[PDB]
Amino acid sequence: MENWSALELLPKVGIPTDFLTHVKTSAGEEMFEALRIYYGDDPERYNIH
Amino acid sequence: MENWSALELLPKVGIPTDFLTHVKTSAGEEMFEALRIYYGDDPERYNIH
Amino acid sequence: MAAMEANIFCTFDHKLSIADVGKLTKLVAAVVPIPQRLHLIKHYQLGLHQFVDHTRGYVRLRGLLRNMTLTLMRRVEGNQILLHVPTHGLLYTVLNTGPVTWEKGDALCVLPPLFHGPLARENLLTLGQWELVLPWIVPMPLALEINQRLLIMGLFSLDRSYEEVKAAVQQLQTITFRDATFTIPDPVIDQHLLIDMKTACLSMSMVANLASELTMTYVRKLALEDSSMLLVKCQELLMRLPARPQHVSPDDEIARLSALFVMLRQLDDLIREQVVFTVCDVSPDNKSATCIFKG
Amino acid sequence: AMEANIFCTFDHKLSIADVGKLTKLVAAVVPIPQRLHLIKHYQLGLHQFVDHTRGYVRLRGLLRNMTLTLMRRVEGNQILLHVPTHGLLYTVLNTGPVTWEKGDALCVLPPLFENLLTLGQWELVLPWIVPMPLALEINQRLLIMGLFSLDRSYEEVKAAVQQLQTITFRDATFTIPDPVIDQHLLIDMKTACLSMSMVANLASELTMTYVRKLALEDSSMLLVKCQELLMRLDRERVSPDDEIARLSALFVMLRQLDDLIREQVVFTVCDVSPDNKSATCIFKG
Amino acid sequence: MDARAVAKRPRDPADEDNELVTALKAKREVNTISVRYLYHADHQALTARFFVPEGLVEFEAQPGALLIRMETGCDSPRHLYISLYLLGIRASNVSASTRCLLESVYTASAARAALQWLDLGPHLLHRRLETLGCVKTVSLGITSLLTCVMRGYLYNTLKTEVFALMIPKDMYLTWEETRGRLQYVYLIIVYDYDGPETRPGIYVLTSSIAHWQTLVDVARGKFARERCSFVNRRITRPRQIPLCTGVIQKLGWCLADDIHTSFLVHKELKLSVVRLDNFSVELGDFREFV
């Protein structure tokens, strides 16, 4: 539902993250709405329309 | 769906329009792909969100 | 996910003497099987030694080797080994590890080793009671002979007396191929040979059922007017028992032969071994050859 | 930069007409006995194997072992042959008697039937490129036709043979030669037929002994059905050394038939011209 | 030949300028056509183009459909190109509800003609079929054009997206608890010899086994009932000469982690499929077993 490609392409501000638990545990236990995970390199960010 | 309020707010180019037949006849006989008609004054364009 | 690796590095965690490394260097371009593919593996998984088991059966070892993936050995370093997974259709150099003589143009199969000569060749990397046992690469006729001997022993074992079974196993286990003598180790009869025996019996039953009268009578009719060494040696195997064909129908003959071909393929498959290499070159000392990989 | 190629030099003088004839074949499949870098024109084609007392099946066996290659370029003093590699696409010429379709699987066969390059005693005999079902049909029909060799006296047998000879494939009809010449059968086809009949005869008597022993143990209820089928077949009609010999003979006669029993695809087609004489296909080996 | 020639590593296919650029540079002539980069110049996959009538193209609009060539037994079309979904109609393996759904989808004259031709003749099903590969494109029309790969991965023009292979859920088959890292996928057609007529089962199998004999032994273990039916027909019904109990054809290889479950939408109807994300095709021929 979110535009993940826009997040990947646009510039970002770097911060030190402070998850209390492991980041994958926070993802797997559904700490957040609107999660996306992918492994390796996913080329879908390259197809602009 | 087309958001007509954006057309209603944003600046527009002045054109001398030329419908061969009456405008309401061309609209009623379904000449145009998408169409919006309202009477009086429609408050829709005022609630920017 | 993680794409399958083509280059595999193997490291021995046992310490290696200079003699061990010297032995390893000789093995470049040989075929070594591995059970699983990773970029970096331990030497325990390398080779056929891991499957040596109290069961000792040759048939089960043949079954296990069929499912491992084959790799060629690239050049060696200190305490490291590099293995390469070949691809179908490309050209490769391969090392003749076993004593079997190769020839130009024949097809090669991978098979568990069977002992030969004095049986003192086993110097291959004995370290920490792990041993580098490698399969044999043999030409098609020898593999066909080996499988045929095993299946014939299995079929003959049924209902025959124990002592004559021993005698038959003794005479069948030895093989002379291309002016060399080999012997099959541990020809155990068990479930693995039993399933092959069942399929062979089924295929033979269907072949006997399908075959037309023309096919059956061809040999009998030929002997009435032909005479040759091939025929007389051929008819000695058969049970001892003008005219016109009682029934002519080419369409029935065609369909019947069509089914009989499928049944013959079913019977053939259990002694056939998959061709892994096809050779067209040979070092005149028979130690190495260049082959096309397939399978 | 060049591609890898095999050079062939003609050991005969060539006229302009001959080289003009060769360049017509600039995409034909040429069989070659050995993978070798430089060869003489005698090694081209199947003419080297042709024999008077041998026939189709021995040629099939020999074609199994030969190396297939494509003629790539024709020049003065030499010919360029390219050996295809597995998994790549190539252009081949439809020298066979049958049109092709997209997706067809092709296999190579000895020719059955214009002549090409008649030199002093050598001819360029190219093989047939045929879709696989047609090759299976041809093999079966020829094998059966050889099986009727002893019975040829009767008119019914002659009619059956003539029906077997005439074969029709898509939009094409042709007749295959009779493997019986001068009322006699060639030694190779004779060996094939004898092997088939021997396998049948040996299996018929060998099967029951082992089936009745093994079916009692059977956990899949199929071997009992095999036993019953054998009993029905029988009702419609020994030293251990002899048993061993009969089993070994059964398996050795089985191995004699593998050339006829199975065949392998060499090309799979995906393109065809309206000029259909040529097509582009990927190589399988 | 010299030492520098041997030492020289081969030219990069990407740093040499192509033939058209070479000619234009040689003459120093401009052209309207953009020429610096050639598309598909580095696609290693082998593709073919197929024409198919409008009625047959349904569920093959999305990329990833398996494409089969079927014989009509006639000279006018000779061959037709159909998908695995259409074979779903004839297969006994597919459930009743899915059969009804995808029978309502293919309500066109061409699809019904394909079904009539399939059931009409006396041959077994696999003798009438030839497998082409997987499709990844569509251009719609009265006659539609499909491009199918027959050796390689499935991807669009820039490789910016890799396509999966879609198998209907009733046809999907596995025989191992924990998957091997590398999986081979096979097509199975198996015949049940009941009284009136043979009912064919159609499956797509994902397995770690590459050896033929071991795979066929596992298959014979799984399909014992059909082998019993084959022998039973051989006994009860002579002069019927059946061949085969089933055929197995290899087509492809993929990684176990790429396997997923998904659905397909067509005319607001949902079909459920198994999805092989990075599937690459590698076709074999039909090998038969008893």
Add this chain to the structure above:
Amino acid sequence: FEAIFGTFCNRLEWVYFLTSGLAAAAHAIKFHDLNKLTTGKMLFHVQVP
């Protein structure tokens, strides 16, 4: 002898879109990102007397 009196080739003539009088009906524009574009549209606003 036989004689060849010259060899001739087709001197093809070139046609351009912007030179044809049919181009008068067109308003031709070049757009390098056209392949990324999905759809384009224009919107009109009319009030009647």
